[PDB]
Write a protein that holds these residues in place. Structure first.
Motif, PDB file in Angstrom:
ATOM      1  N   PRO A  33       0.833  -1.207   0.000  1.00  0.00           N
ATOM      2  CA  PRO A  33       0.000   0.000   0.000  1.00  0.00           C
ATOM      3  C   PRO A  33       0.864   1.251   0.000  1.00  0.00           C
ATOM      4  CG  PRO A  33      -0.876  -1.615   1.556  1.00  0.00           C
ATOM      5  CD  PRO A  33       0.424  -2.176   1.037  1.00  0.00           C
ATOM      6  N   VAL A  34       0.390   2.288  -0.697  1.00  0.00           N
ATOM      7  CA  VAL A  34       1.101   3.559  -0.697  1.00  0.00           C
ATOM      8  C   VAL A  34       1.288   4.016   0.740  1.00  0.00           C
ATOM      9  CG1 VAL A  34       0.816   6.002  -1.202  1.00  0.00           C
ATOM     10  CG2 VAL A  34       0.500   4.320  -3.015  1.00  0.00           C
ATOM     11  N   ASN A  35       2.514   4.404   1.082  1.00  0.00           N
ATOM     12  CA  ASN A  35       2.804   4.908   2.419  1.00  0.00           C
ATOM     13  C   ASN A  35       2.442   6.386   2.477  1.00  0.00           C
ATOM     14  OD1 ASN A  35       3.780   5.571   4.939  1.00  0.00           O
ATOM     15  ND2 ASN A  35       5.765   4.552   4.664  1.00  0.00           N
ATOM     16  N   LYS A  36       1.452   6.726   3.304  1.00  0.00           N
ATOM     17  CA  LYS A  36       1.030   8.115   3.421  1.00  0.00           C
ATOM     18  C   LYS A  36       2.171   9.023   3.867  1.00  0.00           C
ATOM     19  CE  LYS A  36      -2.225   9.076   6.395  1.00  0.00           C
ATOM     20  NZ  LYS A  36      -1.517  10.124   7.182  1.00  0.00           N
ATOM     21  N   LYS A  37       3.182   8.473   4.547  1.00  0.00           N
ATOM     22  CA  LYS A  37       4.312   9.292   4.974  1.00  0.00           C
ATOM     23  C   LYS A  37       5.022   9.930   3.786  1.00  0.00           C
ATOM     24  CE  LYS A  37       7.002   8.093   8.738  1.00  0.00           C
ATOM     25  NZ  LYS A  37       8.122   7.363   9.400  1.00  0.00           N
ATOM     26  N   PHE A  38       5.068   9.238   2.650  1.00  0.00           N
ATOM     27  CA  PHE A  38       5.755   9.733   1.467  1.00  0.00           C
ATOM     28  C   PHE A  38       4.830  10.420   0.482  1.00  0.00           C
ATOM     29  CE2 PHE A  38      10.075   8.018   1.706  1.00  0.00           C
ATOM     30  CZ  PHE A  38       9.945   7.148   2.775  1.00  0.00           C
ATOM     31  N   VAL A  39       3.543  10.087   0.489  1.00  0.00           N
ATOM     32  CA  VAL A  39       2.576  10.646  -0.452  1.00  0.00           C
ATOM     33  C   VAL A  39       1.413  11.187   0.371  1.00  0.00           C
ATOM     34  CG1 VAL A  39       1.483  10.253  -2.671  1.00  0.00           C
ATOM     35  CG2 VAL A  39       3.273   8.698  -1.896  1.00  0.00           C
ATOM     36  N   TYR A  43      -4.455   9.232  -0.253  1.00  0.00           N
ATOM     37  CA  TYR A  43      -5.745   8.678   0.127  1.00  0.00           C
ATOM     38  C   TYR A  43      -6.860   9.712   0.103  1.00  0.00           C
ATOM     39  CZ  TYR A  43      -2.993   4.604   1.254  1.00  0.00           C
ATOM     40  OH  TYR A  43      -2.153   3.510   1.168  1.00  0.00           O
ATOM     41  N   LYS A  44      -6.539  10.975  -0.175  1.00  0.00           N
ATOM     42  CA  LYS A  44      -7.548  11.982  -0.463  1.00  0.00           C
ATOM     43  C   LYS A  44      -7.848  12.099  -1.949  1.00  0.00           C
ATOM     44  CE  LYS A  44      -5.554  14.807   3.214  1.00  0.00           C
ATOM     45  NZ  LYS A  44      -5.236  16.186   3.680  1.00  0.00           N
ATOM     46  N   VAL A  45      -6.998  11.541  -2.805  1.00  0.00           N
ATOM     47  CA  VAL A  45      -7.202  11.572  -4.247  1.00  0.00           C
ATOM     48  C   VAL A  45      -7.729  10.241  -4.769  1.00  0.00           C
ATOM     49  CG1 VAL A  45      -6.048  11.907  -6.470  1.00  0.00           C
ATOM     50  CG2 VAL A  45      -5.439  13.342  -4.511  1.00  0.00           C
ATOM     51  N   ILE A  46      -7.254   9.138  -4.206  1.00  0.00           N
ATOM     52  CA  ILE A  46      -7.553   7.799  -4.695  1.00  0.00           C
ATOM     53  C   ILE A  46      -8.546   7.165  -3.731  1.00  0.00           C
ATOM     54  CG2 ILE A  46      -6.618   5.494  -5.152  1.00  0.00           C
ATOM     55  CD1 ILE A  46      -6.025   7.848  -7.200  1.00  0.00           C
ATOM     56  N   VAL A  47      -9.789   6.991  -4.186  1.00  0.00           N
ATOM     57  CA  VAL A  47     -10.844   6.526  -3.291  1.00  0.00           C
ATOM     58  C   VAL A  47     -10.791   5.021  -3.045  1.00  0.00           C
ATOM     59  CG1 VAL A  47     -12.241   8.445  -4.090  1.00  0.00           C
ATOM     60  CG2 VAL A  47     -12.584   6.182  -5.082  1.00  0.00           C
ATOM     61  N   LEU A  78      -3.443   0.200 -12.085  1.00  0.00           N
ATOM     62  CA  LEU A  78      -3.050   1.077 -13.182  1.00  0.00           C
ATOM     63  C   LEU A  78      -3.895   2.343 -13.203  1.00  0.00           C
ATOM     64  CD1 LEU A  78      -1.581   1.891 -15.735  1.00  0.00           C
ATOM     65  CD2 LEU A  78      -3.158   0.452 -17.036  1.00  0.00           C
ATOM     66  N   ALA A  79      -5.221   2.205 -13.074  1.00  0.00           N
ATOM     67  CA  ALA A  79      -6.088   3.382 -13.141  1.00  0.00           C
ATOM     68  C   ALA A  79      -5.806   4.355 -12.006  1.00  0.00           C
ATOM     69  CB  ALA A  79      -7.560   2.970 -13.124  1.00  0.00           C
ATOM     70  N   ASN A  80      -5.449   3.846 -10.825  1.00  0.00           N
ATOM     71  CA  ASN A  80      -5.103   4.732  -9.718  1.00  0.00           C
ATOM     72  C   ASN A  80      -3.861   5.552 -10.045  1.00  0.00           C
ATOM     73  OD1 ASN A  80      -7.266   3.993  -8.122  1.00  0.00           O
ATOM     74  ND2 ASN A  80      -6.113   2.434  -6.980  1.00  0.00           N
ATOM     75  N   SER A  81      -2.834   4.898 -10.595  1.00  0.00           N
ATOM     76  CA  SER A  81      -1.609   5.613 -10.931  1.00  0.00           C
ATOM     77  C   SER A  81      -1.847   6.607 -12.062  1.00  0.00           C
ATOM     78  CB  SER A  81      -0.512   4.627 -11.312  1.00  0.00           C
ATOM     79  OG  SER A  81       0.452   5.260 -12.131  1.00  0.00           O
ATOM     80  N   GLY A  86      -0.706  10.728 -13.601  1.00  0.00           N
ATOM     81  CA  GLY A  86      -0.858  11.158 -14.970  1.00  0.00           C
ATOM     82  C   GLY A  86      -0.516  10.036 -15.926  1.00  0.00           C
ATOM     83  N   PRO A  87      -0.979  10.149 -17.173  1.00  0.00           N
ATOM     84  CA  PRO A  87      -0.852   9.017 -18.104  1.00  0.00           C
ATOM     85  C   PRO A  87       0.573   8.734 -18.557  1.00  0.00           C
ATOM     86  CG  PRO A  87      -1.676  10.941 -19.254  1.00  0.00           C
ATOM     87  CD  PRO A  87      -1.608  11.324 -17.799  1.00  0.00           C
ATOM     88  N   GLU A  88       1.452   9.735 -18.584  1.00  0.00           N
ATOM     89  CA  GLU A  88       2.814   9.558 -19.074  1.00  0.00           C
ATOM     90  C   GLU A  88       3.856   9.562 -17.962  1.00  0.00           C
ATOM     91  OE1 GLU A  88       4.318   9.747 -22.679  1.00  0.00           O
ATOM     92  OE2 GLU A  88       2.490   8.537 -22.849  1.00  0.00           O
ATOM     93  N   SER A  89       3.434   9.513 -16.702  1.00  0.00           N
ATOM     94  CA  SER A  89       4.375   9.396 -15.599  1.00  0.00           C
ATOM     95  C   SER A  89       5.048   8.026 -15.609  1.00  0.00           C
ATOM     96  CB  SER A  89       3.661   9.616 -14.266  1.00  0.00           C
ATOM     97  OG  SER A  89       4.291   8.897 -13.222  1.00  0.00           O
ATOM     98  N   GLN A  90       6.284   7.988 -15.099  1.00  0.00           N
ATOM     99  CA  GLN A  90       7.027   6.732 -15.054  1.00  0.00           C
ATOM    100  C   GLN A  90       6.348   5.711 -14.148  1.00  0.00           C
ATOM    101  OE1 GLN A  90       9.550   5.527 -16.903  1.00  0.00           O
ATOM    102  NE2 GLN A  90       9.101   3.649 -15.739  1.00  0.00           N
ATOM    103  N   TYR A  91       5.724   6.170 -13.061  1.00  0.00           N
ATOM    104  CA  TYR A  91       4.924   5.274 -12.232  1.00  0.00           C
ATOM    105  C   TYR A  91       3.851   4.583 -13.062  1.00  0.00           C
ATOM    106  CZ  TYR A  91       7.023   7.351  -8.035  1.00  0.00           C
ATOM    107  OH  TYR A  91       7.900   7.771  -7.059  1.00  0.00           O
ATOM    108  N   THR A  92       3.141   5.357 -13.887  1.00  0.00           N
ATOM    109  CA  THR A  92       2.058   4.802 -14.691  1.00  0.00           C
ATOM    110  C   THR A  92       2.580   3.799 -15.709  1.00  0.00           C
ATOM    111  OG1 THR A  92       0.669   6.748 -14.380  1.00  0.00           O
ATOM    112  CG2 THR A  92       0.247   5.406 -16.333  1.00  0.00           C
TER     113      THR A  92
END
Ligand SMILES: CCOC(=O)Nc1cc(-c2ccc(C)c(NS(C)(=O)=O)c2)nn2c(C)nnc12
Length: 130
Positions: A33-39, A43-47, A78-81, A86-92
């Motif tokens: 799970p995404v660590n809220k400490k770093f991001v 959890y306010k953007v991704i429901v 994938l849809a969360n990232s 954004g669609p062209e981010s390296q994470y995505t």
């Protein structure tokens, strides 16, 4: 060999996750799970957050009777990232390769997984008759 169909199906799904999907280069941000400490605002953007460890926990509880509901959670990563980065981010693009590897492997095992999926559904229908 018999009446172990759900146990076998889940076992294959876990191996797909740990051996194929988690092996994607630089995929480690998706392993937990995404660590809220770093991001701080994730959890306010991704429901409906989703990640590979959560999927494994679902697999161990036998949430997935077919690949379709398994793919729902995988595609959700994938849809969360896409939404957050954004669609062209390296994470995505990493998450997109995680999804690609998933589909490629399911296709490799297609005939085999269909057999497990049929037996799982017919057993569940026959067991609920009682
Ligand atoms: C706002 C700029 O964009 C971003 O920083 N986004 C993202 C960042 C990270 C991320 C960072 C650092 C670390 C240490 C981790 N590790 S973990 C699994 O404990 O949370 C993850 N993951 N991530 C995932 C998935 N999807 N997006 C992101």
């Amino acid at each position: 060999s018999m009446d172990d169909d759900q146990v076998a199906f889940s076992f294959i799904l876990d191996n797909i996750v740990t051996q194929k999907m988690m092996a994607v280069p630089d995929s480690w941000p998706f392993h937990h799970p995404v660590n809220k400490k770093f991001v701080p605002d994730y959890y306010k953007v991704i429901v409906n957050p989703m990640d590979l460890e959560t999927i494994r926990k679902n697999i161990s509880k036998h949430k997935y009777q077919s690949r379709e509901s398994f793919l729902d959670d995988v595609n959700l990563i994938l849809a969360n990232s896409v939404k957050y980065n954004g669609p062209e981010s390296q994470y995505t693009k990493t998450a997109q390769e995680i999804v690609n590897v998933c589909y490629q492997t399911l296709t490799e095992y297609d005939e085999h997984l269909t057999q497990l999926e049929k037996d799982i559904c017919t057993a569940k229908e026959a067991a609920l008759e009682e």
